Amino acid sequence: HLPSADWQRAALSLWTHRTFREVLKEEDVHLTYQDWLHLELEIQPEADAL
């Protein structure tokens, strides 16, 4: 779909790596609902990638 597939491969290899899974359990990094909102609020409807 979107830019060069080695970038996507980096993304998915990191998403799949076990140590990343273990990092996702000692969580101040749980991506709070409000945190995600403070992110999503920022994207204007100009260049959305979607």
Scanning the structure block, which residue is given the tokens 């709070």?
Answer: 32
Q: Which is nearer to a copy of itself, 41 or 47 (CB)?
A: 47
* Least Cβ distance, residue 47 to a copy of itself (angstroms): 8
The distance of closest approach from Cβ of residue 13 to a copy of itself in the complex, given in angstroms and rounded to an integer, is: 35
DSSP 8-state class, residue 9: H
Query: What distance in Å separates the CA atoms of residue 4 and residue 11, rounded to the nearest whole number?
Result: 11
Q: For a copy of itself, which is the closer residue by CB, 6 or 40?
A: 40
- Listed in sequence order, the residues at least 6 apart from 29 whose beta carbon sits closer than 8 Å to its beta carbon are 23
- Residues in the site for a copy of itself, rule: CB under 8 A? 44-47
